[PDB]
Amino acid sequence: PNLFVALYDFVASGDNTLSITKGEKLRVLGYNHNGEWCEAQTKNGQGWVPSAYITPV
What we know:
It is classed as transferase. Keywords: beta, ATP-binding, Cell adhesion, Cytoskeleton, Magnesium, Manganese, Nucleus, Phosphoprotein, Proto-oncogene, SH2 domain. The assembly is monomeric. The protein: Proto-oncogene tyrosine-protein kinase ABL1. The organism is Homo sapiens. There is one protein chain. The protein is an all-beta fold. The protein has one domain: SH3 Domains (SH3 type barrels, Roll), CATH 2.30.30.40. It is 0% helix and 46% strand. It has no helices and 5 strands. It has strands spanning 3-6, 25-31, 37-42, 45-50, 54-56. It has a 5-stranded antiparallel β-sheet with strand order 4-3-2-1-5, with no helix packed on it. The protein starts with a strand and ends with a strand.
């Protein structure tokens, strides 16, 4: 039941990216082609975040 946590703050930059805070929880829907970006949902919204900035809880 695939819940995750943010390892660092990430400030939204480009096209359909989402801001996240260190230690907040999110839900993963998927990945991009090469797998460096992850599409996620939080209490603020939905959007792209770096794959390297998150981990399971």
